Design a protein around this ligand. Structure first.
Ligand SMILES: *[C@@H]1O[C@H](CO)[C@@H](O[C@@H]2O[C@H](CO)[C@@H](O[C@@H]3O[C@H](CO)[C@@H](O)[C@H](O)[C@@H]3O)[C@H](O)[C@H]2NC(C)=O)[C@H](O)[C@H]1NC(C)=O
Ligand SMILES: CC(C)CCC[C@@H](C)[C@H]1CC[C@H]2[C@@H]3[C@H](O)C=C4C[C@@H](O)CC[C@]4(C)[C@H]3CC[C@]12C
Ligand SMILES: [Ca+2]
Ligand code: NA
Ligand code: NA
Ligand SMILES: [Zn+2]
Length: 783
């Protein structure tokens, strides 16, 4: 019944016996003497000279006695004060070529130091404010920033860090959520969150335990002061070999709490940042005392940033909806809307769509959210979502706080931090920004664990590490293409299509020639599922034509800086030509489009970028055609006619791969045929949910895209294929006032496209596969 000799013990005592562990306070279940024996505060957290060599007094918070290292309960500055040693921060940086662990240590321990609400720009405050953090940052490995997951809230991001999964997959989709299968709500406050039913995937601590690696208790009751959390980690590190964990987590509530109170740019933020730096210094001094400072891998990481948000920048749903009593709103920096009593979702969305000129949120059905957010495939995510403008809140009805977070994860103010320091991380190395979903694999590598299946791309962060356990290999192609020749005659086709001599004289029309060389710069995409498709060559483009979907899976072409834009002539406006390499039965037909009043068509290779009048006729082949709503053609035609040439002019040429995506079940993965829920009327021509483009050029812009010796540069998009442009409030204006903005909102990683298409890109380059994996995870943010 007593905590004597049991403070912060690792074995969790079962109900009903009283507890002495990290979380006992949170369950209101600690022993009667917990707050006294375990949460001692007497004399503070720093040795003074007068305490050196004292006899142990049990009331003291930490000790300066000669027996204190045998418990790991010395104050962290003990040796500096009593043994003449220096502070870790005052020592010069010295590369750690190999781990330097003391006796009993099998592997380098990992410590995760997580800081809530630590905005990336706070790092600009430098060594005068944060000397310890700045040393870790400059001497180890760091990124300019780390991208969090949406929503940019604590619970979703801490659990993504732990699992390598998107919130839609791990289940922690918000700080607040409702599960219709449990008929219950999860909240930051309360007991509900402690039930295991909420938590999916496999977090790091469980991955560790399953593979024989001991994990410290990651979670800390808020009432445990930060100094005690550090001392407890150091005490655990002092345990015998068979009881000592290999992985630990420290969590701080700061700088989030001050961020909320004063905003991210308040002068009041300096003191919270100074205190966090002190805590880091305590940890590093503590490790130095135990001879672990050149043995431990340390990860200093945040969960999200902070934005200026005040109560007078609140949009109220009662100013748009006349029936606010019928809905339930999860409010704030995002909006999720649910019925109160199981109202009509389509009328709700319409009533929230572009109703005031300066409206500071936008409504979406979850399947229409930008696919980069990966925020749809979970029954806990409400069908109706509001994406709120940075600096604003949305509330149901009608300052103490000046900051908040939760917004779109590509917003600058939401970006957070990453520093890795220790023998396994690189020395004085800057790395590009990356997403927090990638760290679980690295933390597994750092511990010798096989990661559970997750949304990271294993190998994309090998460049953070001095030594790598995991070597990525490129997946094998599943479906091999056919390469059909000119087989059929014009007379054999009856597609109901029309058109308005020199092809006859060209014996090697549609042969490979130099097409593959100049239009497929990085090798053909591999098809990673089972299907039947044809490679088709042309002067200006190459494509992989699916005989199942009756359209290309991909279309590839290169446009030089100097390329000419031309118009579609009047006589070719409605031209569609049958492809003599592909059978009538595996082709689309024009009558289906005549029959379908809602549906039109577009082209994947644009007629506007043909190299000659002769070549232009290839662009009107039936095998280059794809179903497009008239509304979407305004977007697509502008992209094709105007933006591609712009990008070619800005980037010293570009290579473009475009194609359809089918994702009717909004799971972020390529649909099977059975999952396709819409076809062109009276046909088996499937309707894409989205269209992608991947735009590649040389990172060194002094080299043209087709003669690039080095690293590549990529931007990509996944555009929703919608029958209206309601998403774009300026869409009644000229396309130059809104199309490019739409596309930037739907920016994407090549990896996102790979999941949605079952294709593998960049299979033939001069770059290493790990470098390619980094390229595939890149997101062009426009921030
Ligand atoms: C993000 O990563 C997660 C985890 O890898 C992906 O979720 C996983 O998706 C696969 C494929 O749909 C699921 O596989 C299923 O396994 C069961 C096992 O019996 C099988 O019956 C099914 O036929 C199927 O093979 C798997 O359950 C699921 N895992 C988890 C933890 O949810 C997810 O697809 C990834 N997301 C993206 C956008 O890439
Ligand atoms: C900061 C406190 C107020 C809240 C404490 C965090 C709390 C939500 C933690 C405490 C215990 C955690 C669970 C436990 O570690 C084991 C598992 C097994 C694994 O399969 C899924 C995760 C789960 C259920 C943990 C979830 C997070 C819990 C509830
Ligand atoms: Ca799908
Ligand atoms: Na039509
Ligand atoms: Na509009
Ligand atoms: Zn917060």
């Amino acid at each position: 019944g007593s905590c004597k000799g049991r403070c912060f013990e690792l074995q969790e005592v079962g109900p009903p016996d009283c507890r002495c562990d990290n979380l006992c306070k949170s369950y209101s279940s600690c022993c009667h003497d917990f707050d006294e024996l375990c949460l001692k505060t007497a004399r503070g957290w720093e040795c003074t000279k007068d305490r050196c060599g004292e006899v142990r007094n049990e009331e003291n918070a930490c000790h300066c006695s000669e027996d204190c290292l045998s418990r790991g309960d010395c104050c962290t500055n003990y040796q500096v004060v009593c043994k003449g040693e220096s502070h870790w921060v005052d020592d010069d940086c010295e590369e750690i070529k190999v781990p330097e662990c003391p006796a009993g240590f099998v592997r380098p321990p990992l410590i995760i130091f997580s800081v809530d609400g630590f905005r990336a720009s706070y790092m600009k405050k430098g060594s005068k404010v944060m000397p310890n953090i700045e040393k870790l940052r400059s001497c180890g490995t760091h990124a300019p920033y780390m991208r969090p997951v949406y929503p940019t809230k604590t619970f979703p991001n801490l659990y993504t860090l732990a699992t390598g999964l998107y919130p839609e997959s791990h289940g922690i989709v918000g700080n607040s959520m409702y599960d219709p299968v449990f008929d219950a709500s999860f909240h930051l406050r309360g007991r509900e969150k402690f039930n295991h039913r909420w938590w999916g995937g496999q977090p790091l601590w469980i991955t560790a335990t399953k593979q024989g690696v001991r994990a410290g208790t990651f979670f800390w009751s808020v009432s445990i002061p930060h100094e005690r959390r550090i001392l407890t980690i150091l005490q655990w590190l002092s345990l015998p070999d068979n009881e000592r964990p290999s992985v630990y987590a420290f969590y701080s509530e700061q700088p989030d709490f001050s961020g909320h109170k004063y905003g991210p740019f308040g002068p009041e933020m300096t003191n919270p940042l100074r205190e966090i730096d002190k805590t880091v210094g305590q940890l590093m001094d503590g490790l130095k005392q135990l001879r672990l400072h050149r043995c431990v891998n340390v990860i200093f990481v945040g969960d999200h940033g902070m934005e200026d948000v005040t109560c007078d920048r609140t949009e109220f749903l009662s100013n748009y909806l006349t029936n606010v009593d019928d809905i339930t709103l999860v409010p704030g920096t995002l909006g999720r809307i649910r019925a109160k009593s199981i109202y009509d979702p389509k009328t709700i969305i319409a009533a929230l769509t572009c109703k005031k000129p300066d409206q500071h949120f936008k409504p979406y059905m979850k399947q229409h959210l930008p696919k980069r957010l990966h925020y749809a495939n979970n029954r806990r995510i409400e069908d109706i979502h509001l994406l709120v403008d940075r600096r604003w809140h949305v509330a149901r009805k009608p300052c103490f706080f000046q900051g908040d977070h939760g917004f779109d994860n590509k917003v600058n103010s939401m970006q957070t931090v990453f520093v890795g320091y220790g023998p396994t991380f690189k020395y004085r190395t800057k790395v590009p920004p990356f997403e927090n979903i990638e760290l679980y694999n690295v933390m597994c590598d750092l511990l010798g664990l096989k990661p559970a299946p997750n949304n990271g791309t294993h190998g994309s962060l090998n460049h953070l590490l001095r030594t790598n356990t995991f070597r990525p290999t490129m997946p094998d192609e599943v479906s091999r293409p056919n390469y059909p020749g000119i087989m059929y005659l014009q007379s054999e086709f009856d597609l109901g299509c029309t058109c308005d001599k020199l092809e006859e004289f060209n014996k090697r029309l549609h042969t490979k020639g130099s097409t593959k060389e100049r239009h497929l710069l990085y090798g053909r995409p591999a098809v990673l599922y089972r299907t039947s498709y044809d490679i088709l060559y042309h002067t200006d483009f190459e494509s992989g034509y699916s005989e199942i979907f009756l359209m290309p899976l991909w279309t590839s072409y290169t446009i030089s800086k100097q390329a000419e834009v031309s118009s579609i002539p009047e006589h070719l406006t409605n031209c569609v030509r049958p492809d003599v390499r592909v059978s009538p039965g595996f082709s689309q037909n024009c009558l289906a489009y005549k029959n379908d009043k809602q549906m039109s068509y577009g082209f994947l290779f644009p007629p506007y970028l043909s190299s000659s009048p002769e070549a232009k006729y290839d662009a009107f082949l039936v095998t280059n055609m794809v179903p497009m709503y008239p509304a979407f053609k305004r977007v697509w035609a502008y992209f094709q006619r105007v933006l591609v040439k712009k990008y070619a002019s800005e980037r010293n040429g570009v290579n473009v791969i475009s194609g359809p995506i089918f994702d009717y079940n909004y799971d972020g993965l390529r649909d099977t045929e059975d999952e396709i829920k819409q076809y062109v009327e009276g046909s088996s021509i499937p309707v894409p949910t989205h269209y992608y483009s991947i735009i590649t050029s040389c990172l060194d812009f002094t080299q043209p895209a087709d003669k690039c010796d080095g690293p590549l540069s990529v931007s990509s998009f996944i555009l929703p294929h919608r029958p209206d442009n309601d998403e774009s409030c300026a869409s009644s204006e000229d396309e130059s006032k809104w199309v490019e903005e739409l596309m930037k909102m739907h920016t994407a990683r090549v990896r996102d496209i790979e999941h949605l298409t079952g294709l593998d890109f960049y299979r033939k380059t001069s770059r290493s596969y790990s470098e390619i994996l980094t390229l595939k995870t890149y997101l062009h943010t426009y921030e």
